[PDB]
Design an enzyme around this catalytic site. Structure first.
Site, mmCIF file in Angstrom:
data_model
loop_
_atom_site.group_PDB
_atom_site.id
_atom_site.type_symbol
_atom_site.label_atom_id
_atom_site.label_comp_id
_atom_site.label_asym_id
_atom_site.label_seq_id
_atom_site.Cartn_x
_atom_site.Cartn_y
_atom_site.Cartn_z
ATOM 1 N N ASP A 14 0.834 -1.128 0.042
ATOM 2 C CA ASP A 14 -0.026 0.121 -0.019
ATOM 3 C C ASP A 14 0.782 1.312 -0.221
ATOM 4 O OD1 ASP A 14 -3.189 0.929 0.558
ATOM 5 O OD2 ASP A 14 -1.844 2.089 1.863
ATOM 6 N N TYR B 42 3.010 9.675 0.410
ATOM 7 C CA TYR B 42 4.132 9.027 1.111
ATOM 8 C C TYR B 42 5.589 9.447 0.861
ATOM 9 C CZ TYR B 42 0.159 5.913 2.217
ATOM 10 O OH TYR B 42 -0.965 5.526 2.849
ATOM 11 N N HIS C 262 -7.630 9.429 -2.411
ATOM 12 C CA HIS C 262 -6.684 9.370 -1.027
ATOM 13 C C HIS C 262 -7.566 9.961 0.000
ATOM 14 C CE1 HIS C 262 -2.691 9.209 0.997
ATOM 15 N NE2 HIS C 262 -3.531 9.395 1.937
HETATM 16 N N1 NAP Z 1 -5.814 6.262 3.350
HETATM 17 C C1 NAP Z 1 -5.300 6.841 4.562
HETATM 18 O O1 NAP Z 1 -5.737 8.055 4.696
HETATM 19 C C2 NAP Z 1 -4.307 6.275 5.363
HETATM 20 C C3 NAP Z 1 -3.924 6.948 6.616
HETATM 21 C C4 NAP Z 1 -3.036 6.457 7.330
HETATM 22 C C5 NAP Z 1 -2.496 5.136 7.004
HETATM 23 N N2 NAP Z 1 -2.723 4.682 5.863
HETATM 24 C C6 NAP Z 1 -2.004 3.153 5.488
HETATM 25 O O2 NAP Z 1 -2.460 2.381 6.612
HETATM 26 C C7 NAP Z 1 -0.956 1.848 6.700
HETATM 27 C C8 NAP Z 1 -0.853 1.426 8.221
HETATM 28 O O3 NAP Z 1 -1.654 2.111 9.036
HETATM 29 P P1 NAP Z 1 -0.736 3.187 10.095
HETATM 30 O O4 NAP Z 1 -0.098 4.091 9.175
HETATM 31 O O5 NAP Z 1 -1.607 3.759 11.232
HETATM 32 O O6 NAP Z 1 0.332 1.997 10.698
HETATM 33 P P2 NAP Z 1 -0.310 0.914 11.745
HETATM 34 O O7 NAP Z 1 -0.961 -0.220 10.959
HETATM 35 O O8 NAP Z 1 -1.579 1.715 12.389
HETATM 36 O O9 NAP Z 1 0.623 0.499 12.883
HETATM 37 C C9 NAP Z 1 1.236 1.732 13.306
HETATM 38 C C10 NAP Z 1 2.522 1.101 14.172
HETATM 39 O O10 NAP Z 1 2.310 -0.252 14.650
HETATM 40 C C11 NAP Z 1 3.534 -0.949 14.972
HETATM 41 N N3 NAP Z 1 3.514 -2.377 14.816
HETATM 42 C C12 NAP Z 1 3.198 -2.817 13.331
HETATM 43 N N4 NAP Z 1 3.149 -4.075 13.631
HETATM 44 C C13 NAP Z 1 3.376 -4.364 14.754
HETATM 45 C C14 NAP Z 1 3.515 -5.760 15.830
HETATM 46 N N5 NAP Z 1 3.256 -6.880 15.106
HETATM 47 N N6 NAP Z 1 3.418 -5.520 16.861
HETATM 48 C C15 NAP Z 1 3.679 -4.541 17.506
HETATM 49 N N7 NAP Z 1 3.839 -3.327 17.023
HETATM 50 C C16 NAP Z 1 3.428 -3.317 15.795
HETATM 51 C C17 NAP Z 1 4.541 -0.253 13.901
HETATM 52 O O11 NAP Z 1 5.746 0.296 14.726
HETATM 53 P P3 NAP Z 1 6.815 -0.394 13.753
HETATM 54 O O12 NAP Z 1 6.873 0.241 12.281
HETATM 55 O O13 NAP Z 1 8.200 0.478 14.633
HETATM 56 O O14 NAP Z 1 6.935 -1.933 13.739
HETATM 57 C C18 NAP Z 1 3.944 1.042 13.654
HETATM 58 O O15 NAP Z 1 4.782 2.216 13.894
HETATM 59 C C19 NAP Z 1 0.073 2.906 6.478
HETATM 60 O O16 NAP Z 1 1.332 2.428 6.197
HETATM 61 C C20 NAP Z 1 -0.737 3.570 5.181
HETATM 62 O O17 NAP Z 1 -0.264 2.907 4.139
HETATM 63 C C21 NAP Z 1 -3.619 5.110 5.217
HETATM 64 O O1 BT9 Z 2 -1.946 7.706 4.151
HETATM 65 C C1 BT9 Z 2 -1.348 8.156 5.133
HETATM 66 O O2 BT9 Z 2 -0.359 7.209 5.609
HETATM 67 C C2 BT9 Z 2 -1.083 9.406 5.413
HETATM 68 C C3 BT9 Z 2 -0.125 10.048 6.074
HETATM 69 C C4 BT9 Z 2 -0.115 11.468 6.875
HETATM 70 C C5 BT9 Z 2 -1.290 11.800 6.398
HETATM 71 C C6 BT9 Z 2 -2.302 11.482 6.082
HETATM 72 N N1 BT9 Z 2 -3.440 12.354 5.747
HETATM 73 C C7 BT9 Z 2 -4.778 12.220 5.926
HETATM 74 C C8 BT9 Z 2 -5.790 13.056 5.442
HETATM 75 C C9 BT9 Z 2 -7.151 13.022 5.632
HETATM 76 C C10 BT9 Z 2 -7.513 11.935 6.212
HETATM 77 C C11 BT9 Z 2 -9.044 11.949 6.534
HETATM 78 F F1 BT9 Z 2 -9.256 10.771 6.865
HETATM 79 F F2 BT9 Z 2 -9.310 12.631 7.524
HETATM 80 F F3 BT9 Z 2 -9.742 12.352 5.471
HETATM 81 C C12 BT9 Z 2 -6.808 11.246 6.971
HETATM 82 C C13 BT9 Z 2 -5.502 11.194 6.830
HETATM 83 C C14 BT9 Z 2 -2.402 10.416 5.430
#
Ligand code: NAP
Ligand code: BT9
Length: 315
Positions: A45, A50, A112
């Site tokens: 993803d 990013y 996004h």
């Molecule tokens: N569409 C959007 O707006 C949006 C927003 C946020 C995120 N995302 C996507 O969702 C993905 C993940 O969401 P997230 O950014 O919040 O990360 P996350 O899945 O919520 O996990 C965050 C933390 O969990 C820890 N972690 C992972 N696996 C673990 C395990 N097995 N045991 C203990 N700790 C663990 C990691 O620390 P470590 O890394 O040091 O292992 C990481 O810093 C992101 O990479 C991104 O691609 C999308």
């Molecule tokens: O994708 C990431 O890893 C990522 C990382 C940093 C910022 C954002 N931004 C964002 C923008 C809007 C919303 C929302 F959901 F409020 F619309 C949530 C997050 C996404």
């Protein structure tokens, strides 16, 4: 170990999250993406926000090269950022992503965020008062440009992210709709299980994809320090001793057993390899019942800045 998307394609129910804060060296994204694949991750993803599609795409060339995997085995996702919502910017933005990551196509291209921002290259437009500048864009026109991208072949599938039921419906109920969004990637975790949103998506054969399934990375830029730490919850920690796994594994399994494709972000070798162990056990129906009652409508990504947006997903 995949789900059938509403366009015929298959999405691996376990995705790897590639996002990491800017202060983190970009070379890590390259390294960890190699690890992630070596661990079993096939779903990856990413997004233009990013700033790592060059390293991620690089790590995939490496794994295809050394014979660890073929392109058809890897599920790669990218995202159109909020500054490219205008119809004429969609395809060029996609091609840009394709270039950096040096790929022919992306398995999935998402919107996004529904919160449109000022058209331009700067990813966080700010007026002379340092305030983020919004833009008004009919998201139905943006989706049309996404449909042209699937026909153009540049994207095997198209879906949305951070869309609430309303905005989602605006798509489905839009005239001349050729492709439904295959999925909707949104924040989803035991403290915010999106019970209702998940229900709606299923009736439309759409897939809820969960991010921050492990409580988020708790960035000081959006996440309140006084908020609960997910992976320290009593119920999750207790169920972890019961099944003799980890709280993160319980969180991820929780999602799998209820029809949610879930993303796991990790830049740590042993926590990446541990996350794939989600397929090695199963929580009981009662455990699912117990976790279902952990919801406190608490989303870690908390920016009151966006609350003022007419497309602010929450309301
Ligand atoms: N569409 C959007 O707006 C949006 C927003 C946020 C995120 N995302 C996507 O969702 C993905 C993940 O969401 P997230 O950014 O919040 O990360 P996350 O899945 O919520 O996990 C965050 C933390 O969990 C820890 N972690 C992972 N696996 C673990 C395990 N097995 N045991 C203990 N700790 C663990 C990691 O620390 P470590 O890394 O040091 O292992 C990481 O810093 C992101 O990479 C991104 O691609 C999308
Ligand atoms: O994708 C990431 O890893 C990522 C990382 C940093 C910022 C954002 N931004 C964002 C923008 C809007 C919303 C929302 F959901 F409020 F619309 C949530 C997050 C996404």
């Amino acid at each position: 170990q995949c789900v059938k998307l509403n366009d015929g394609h298959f999405m691996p129910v376990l995705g790897f999250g590639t996002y990491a804060p800017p202060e983190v060296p970009r070379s890590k994204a390259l390294e960890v993406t190699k690890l992630a694949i070596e661990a079993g991750f096939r779903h990856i993803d990413s997004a233009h926000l990013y700033n790592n599609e060059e390293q991620v795409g690089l790590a995939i060339r490496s794994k295809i090269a050394d014979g660890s995997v073929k392109r058809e085995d890897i599920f790669y996702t990218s995202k159109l950022w909020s500054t490219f919502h205008r119809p004429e910017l969609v395809r060029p933005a996609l091609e840009n992503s394709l270039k950096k990551a040096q790929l022919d196509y992306v398995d999935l291209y998402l919107i996004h965020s529904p919160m449109s921002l000022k058209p331009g290259e700067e990813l966080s437009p700010t007026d002379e008062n340092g305030k983020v500048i919004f833009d008004i864009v009919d998201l139905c026109t943006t989706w049309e440009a996404m449909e042209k991208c699937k026909d153009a072949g540049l994207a095997k599938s198209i879906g949305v992210s951070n869309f609430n039921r309303r905005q989602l419906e605006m798509i489905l109920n839009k005239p001349g709709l050729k492709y439904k969004p295959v999925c909707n990637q949104v924040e989803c975790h035991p403290y915010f299980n999106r019970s209702k949103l998940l229900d709606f998506c299923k009736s439309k054969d759409i897939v809820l994809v969960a991010y921050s399934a492990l409580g988020s990375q708790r960035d000081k830029r959006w996440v309140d320090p006084n908020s609960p730490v997910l992976l320290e919850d009593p119920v999750l920690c207790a169920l972890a001793k019961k099944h003799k796994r980890t709280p993160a594994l319980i969180a991820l399994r929780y999602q799998l057993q209820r029809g949610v494709v879930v993303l796991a972000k990790s830049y740590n070798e042993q926590r990446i390899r541990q996350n794939v162990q989600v397929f090695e056990f199963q929580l009981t129906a009662e455990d699912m019942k117990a976790i279902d009652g952990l919801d406190r409508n608490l989303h870690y990504f908390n920016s009151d800045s966006f609350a003022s947006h007419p497309n602010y997903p929450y309301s």
